[PDB]
Design an enzyme around this catalytic site. Structure first.
Site, PDB file in Angstrom:
ATOM      1  N   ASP A  25      13.598  14.483  -1.043  1.00 18.63           N
ATOM      2  CA  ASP A  25      14.147  13.487  -1.944  1.00 18.63           C
ATOM      3  C   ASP A  25      13.111  13.158  -3.007  1.00 18.63           C
ATOM      4  O   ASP A  25      11.924  12.994  -2.699  1.00 18.63           O
ATOM      5  CB  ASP A  25      14.560  12.223  -1.190  1.00 18.63           C
ATOM      6  CG  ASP A  25      15.469  12.514  -0.011  1.00 18.63           C
ATOM      7  OD1 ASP A  25      15.126  13.396   0.807  1.00 18.63           O
ATOM      8  OD2 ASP A  25      16.522  11.847   0.101  1.00 18.63           O
ATOM      9  N   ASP A  37      17.542  15.559  -3.291  1.00 13.05           N
ATOM     10  CA  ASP A  37      18.198  14.264  -3.414  1.00 13.05           C
ATOM     11  C   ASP A  37      17.476  13.449  -4.476  1.00 13.05           C
ATOM     12  O   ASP A  37      16.255  13.277  -4.409  1.00 13.05           O
ATOM     13  CB  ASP A  37      18.221  13.516  -2.080  1.00 13.05           C
ATOM     14  CG  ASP A  37      19.536  13.688  -1.340  1.00 13.05           C
ATOM     15  OD1 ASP A  37      19.794  14.795  -0.824  1.00 13.05           O
ATOM     16  OD2 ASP A  37      20.319  12.717  -1.282  1.00 13.05           O
ATOM     17  N   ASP A  40      15.188  20.282   2.553  1.00 12.98           N
ATOM     18  CA  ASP A  40      15.603  19.199   1.680  1.00 12.98           C
ATOM     19  C   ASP A  40      14.456  18.219   1.490  1.00 12.98           C
ATOM     20  O   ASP A  40      13.699  17.939   2.426  1.00 12.98           O
ATOM     21  CB  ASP A  40      16.850  18.479   2.220  1.00 12.98           C
ATOM     22  CG  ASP A  40      16.606  17.795   3.542  1.00 12.98           C
ATOM     23  OD1 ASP A  40      16.212  18.485   4.506  1.00 12.98           O
ATOM     24  OD2 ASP A  40      16.821  16.568   3.621  1.00 12.98           O
TER      25      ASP A  40
END
Ligand code: NA
Length: 355
Positions: free
Chosen positions: A71, A121, A69
């Site tokens: 952002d 994100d 992940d």
């Protein structure tokens, strides 16, 4: 013993794989490129940049069905004083519906996009300043140091300075001089504002200051800091049933960065030092059955441990106290096999035996 080659192999084993690295790079690249070329948003979108543990090179390999992940922070020029946080966030719903239908969800302070190979994100932010200060901040946010696609580990020369330019292996008489971080008077008291739907207001956030502090601390610790963060995260993962759910993620990374001294010379010495310092520094807080306040690197008024409970912190302190005896005896051992066996009791089978 220190067993430096064993620690190098262990770190190679717990870093995200090359496949996962390429996956997060591809996802961020595609998302940022599609944001850049989306006409309905070209007026409000100032720029985009990367944040997260993978950007700071403090992330460990995802296990099993988990995916990497990252952002993507979107710096916009919206007026947070004249637009609600929900309206600012909803301005980006047509984009998500066009490019990621059925894979995005609204969250408190961001949007979450779930692909099969990566999780992204989307963080919408705004600049509180105006006029010449906003102009200088936008100069900073459009520079190559902010727009970079490389993780902290891949660019030792990186500084938070609008004059910094990346290097591809070789350069000589052109500019072999190392630039430094821009003076703090240009960014330290200039955080971005971030929508919060659950509080329904604009809060302050300063990812660039956090990234810059991480890079500088890694330089001051001879590159051992991010690897120590990774090793402690891996230790926590291998002993998750004996440890509280929190701290984890960035609060844990922040605790580690606070405990570690400058000038680290090896992984083993750094581990023992940071654990001893954590235990002595917070012994009073622990005996008070309380938790420490630790200010965010960009917003001093924000406590990184705000959501951590005193009970979870004291459980974690006891976990560190138990791990520190093993670490001290592993470092003190003069036999390679015994030392490696103790390091493996800490970290598991990903830490190799010399023979
Ligand atoms: Na420190």
């Amino acid at each position: 013993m220190e067993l430096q080659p064993q620690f190098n192999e262990f770190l190679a084993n717990i870093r995200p794989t090359d496949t996962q690295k390429e996956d997060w790079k591809s996802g961020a690249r595609t998302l940022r490129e599609r944001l850049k070329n989306f006409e309905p948003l070209k007026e409000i979108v100032v720029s985009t940049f990367l944040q997260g543990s993978i950007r700071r090179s403090t992330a460990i390999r995802p296990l099993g069905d988990k995916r990497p992940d990252v952002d993507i922070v979107v710096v916009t020029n919206l007026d947070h004083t004249r637009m609600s946080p929900t309206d600012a966030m909803d301005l980006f719903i047509p984009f998500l519906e066009k490019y990621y239908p059925g894979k995005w969800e609204t969250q408190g302070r961001s949007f979450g996009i779930t692909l099969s190979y990566v999780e992204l994100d989307l963080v919408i932010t705004a600049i509180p300043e105006s006029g010449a200060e906003k102009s200088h901040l936008e100069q900073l946010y459009k520079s190559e140091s902010v727009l970079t696609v490389n993780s902290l580990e891949e660019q030792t020369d990186w500084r938070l300075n609008k004059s910094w330019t990346p290097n591809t292996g070789w350069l000589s008489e052109s500019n072999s001089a190392q630039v430094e971080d821009a003076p703090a008077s240009e960014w330290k008291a200039h955080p971005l504002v971030l929508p919060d739907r659950e509080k329904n207001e604009w809060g302050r956030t300063h990812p660039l200051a956090q990234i810059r502090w991480t890079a500088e601390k890694n330089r001051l610790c001879n590159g051992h800091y991010i690897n120590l963060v990774r090793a402690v995260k891996w230790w926590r993962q291998q002993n998750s049933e004996d440890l509280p759910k929190y701290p984890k993620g960035y609060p844990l990374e922040h605790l580690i960065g606070n405990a570690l001294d400058n000038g680290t010379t090896s992984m083993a010495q750094g581990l023992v030092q940071l654990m001893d310092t954590f235990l002595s520094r917070w012994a009073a807080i622990y005996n008070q059955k309380s938790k420490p306040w630790l200010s965010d690197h960009g917003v001093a008024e924000h406590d990184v441990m705000a959501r951590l409970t005193a009970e979870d912190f004291c459980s974690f302190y006891e976990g560190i106290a138990s791990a520190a005896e093993i670490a001290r005896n592993a470092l003190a051992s003069e036999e390679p096999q015994e030392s490696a066996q103790l390091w493996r009791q800490l970290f598991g089978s990903k830490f190799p035996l010399p023979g």
